[PDB]
Design a protein around this ligand. Structure first.
Ligand SMILES: C[N+](C)(C)[C@@H](Cc1cnc[nH]1)C(=O)O
Ligand SMILES: [Cl-]
Ligand SMILES: [Cl-]
Ligand SMILES: [Mg+2]
Length: 429
């Protein structure tokens, strides 16, 4: 065993192992490349079919070994690493060997050999171009040619909940801030009326034909604060992406991992308070995509329909009625008949849908876990949570997979429990 010299596996050998249950093929490129972005100009992007994502970026994470174990990558597995180059794999190969993995090989010919021949199977996140890497945003704001972009009008929007300091403390150059209160009402925590959305989008400089790039800043939400949501900026960004896509912005992108991805890439930060450039007319009837939103009467119908389900994206203490999740909800319990899809640790964290760096979790893992609960694309799914934020992030993950009938039930537990006639469950199921 040599911690620093790694066996090469040939293309022929790896081809013969694609179906092996005992082989784990590990893509150490960025998660955005794994999803399908052609980050080196390859003609076919994505990953080797069956490969898992383990970005070499994560080697500096003190919890690296726990990430690997949670991915079910075990020492008895044969580990095959690849990246754009075998040199990109060397540190990861050594890290596996230092932690008791004795069967570790490096595949040298993923690019250009594997990517370049159409008989070598690859996979990709179907709608990966909605989930953009920092390098794409940098090219956009620099006026440079970038893939998956044919527009001439864009805006980069920094989302926050009543927390302008989230933006003023550091933001992507030229970006403007959007408080989530611009597009959702504090009375209902639902999306605002069409007339309000039209005015708010126009005042923020957004037309239906503007490419809107949304991101937020994660600032370590604390349940002891009056407004922990003010620190969950990137959930808020995906919430606004949902409302904008519902409203009719044709081209909405989300920066994968939010602000952390921008600074991790080494790009310059701005603290300017950028004034808005208003536009006079949104340019499309609102809402253009009403099917993206489900309200309570439709949600009740979906609970009675075989081809439909509500998907509860809340924490386990919320689900069993231990806590409400919120300092503004007193009632505790759950909507009867929903399928549980645990979000993470509480209302302000999405650990089960994210990596430690806040990029979206490897989509195969989300897909496979969902399938175990019957959360599958042949259904009409309405994702929901307390009041729509976490549900929007789950919804966006399904949208990225190309699922054809996914919605957010906007009202969530807030609306449901606000009517004392609605039934609810509590306790361990
Ligand atoms: C709808 N507001 C903005 C009031 C929510 C947003 C939210 C974040 N994670 C769950 N919900 C809140 O901050 O509690
Ligand atoms: Cl966040
Ligand atoms: Cl619930
Ligand atoms: Mg709501």
């Amino acid at each position: 065993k040599n911690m620093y010299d790694h066996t090469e596996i040939t293309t022929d050998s790896l081809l013969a192992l694609l179906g092996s249950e005992k082989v784990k093929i590990i893509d150490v490129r960025s998660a955005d490349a794994y999803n399908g972005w052609r980050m080196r100009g390859e003609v076919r992007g994505g990953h080797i079919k069956g490969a898992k994502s383990l970005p070499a970026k994560w080697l500096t994470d003190p919890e690296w070994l726990n990430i690997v174990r949670f991915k079910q990558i075990r020492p008895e597995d044969a580990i095959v690493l690849y990246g754009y180059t075998p040199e990109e794999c060397e540190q990861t190969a050594t890290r596996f060997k230092e932690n008791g993995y004795n069967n570790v090989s490096v595949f040298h010919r993923f690019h250009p050999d594997w990517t370049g021949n159409d008989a070598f199977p690859m996979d990709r996140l179907e709608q990966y171009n909605r989930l953009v890497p920092a390098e794409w945003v940098n090219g956009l704001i620099s006026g440079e040619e970038i893939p998956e972009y044919d527009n001439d009008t864009f805006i980069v929007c920094h989302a926050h909940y009543r927390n302008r300091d989230a933006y003023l403390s550091g933001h992507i150059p030229g970006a403007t801030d959007m408080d989530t209160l611009a597009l959702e009402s504090p009375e209902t925590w639902n999306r605002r009326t069409p007339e309000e959305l039209k005015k708010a989008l126009e005042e923020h400089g957004i037309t239906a034909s503007t490419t809107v790039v949304l991101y937020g800043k994660f600032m370590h939400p604390d349940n002891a604060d009056e407004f922990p949501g003010s620190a969950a900026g990137h959930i808020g960004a995906i919430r606004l992406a949902f409302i904008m896509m519902y409203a009719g912005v044709e081209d909405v992108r989300v920066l994968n991992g939010g602000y952390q991805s921008w600074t991790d890439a080494g790009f310059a930060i701005s603290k300017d308070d950028v004034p808005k450039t208003t536009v006079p007319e949104f340019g499309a009837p609102i809402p253009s995509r009403p099917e993206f939103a489900v309200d309570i009467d439709e949600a009740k119908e979906m609970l009675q329909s075989e081809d439909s389900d509500l998907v509860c994206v809340r924490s386990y203490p919320e689900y069993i009625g231990e806590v409400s999740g919120y300092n503004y909800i007193k009632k505790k319990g759950r909507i009867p008949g929903a399928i549980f899809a645990e979000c993470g640790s509480d209302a302000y964290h999405m650990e089960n849908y994210r990596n430690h760096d806040h990029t979206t979790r490897e989509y195969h893992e989300i897909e496979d876990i969902w399938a175990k609960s019957g959360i599958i694309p042949k259904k009409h799914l309405a994702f929901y949570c307390g009041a729509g934020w976490r549900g929007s992030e789950a919804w966006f993950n399904a949208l990225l997979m190309g699922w054809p009938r996914v919605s957010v039930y906007d009202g969530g537990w807030f609306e449901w429990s606000n009517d004392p006639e609605n039934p609810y469950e509590t306790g361990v199921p």
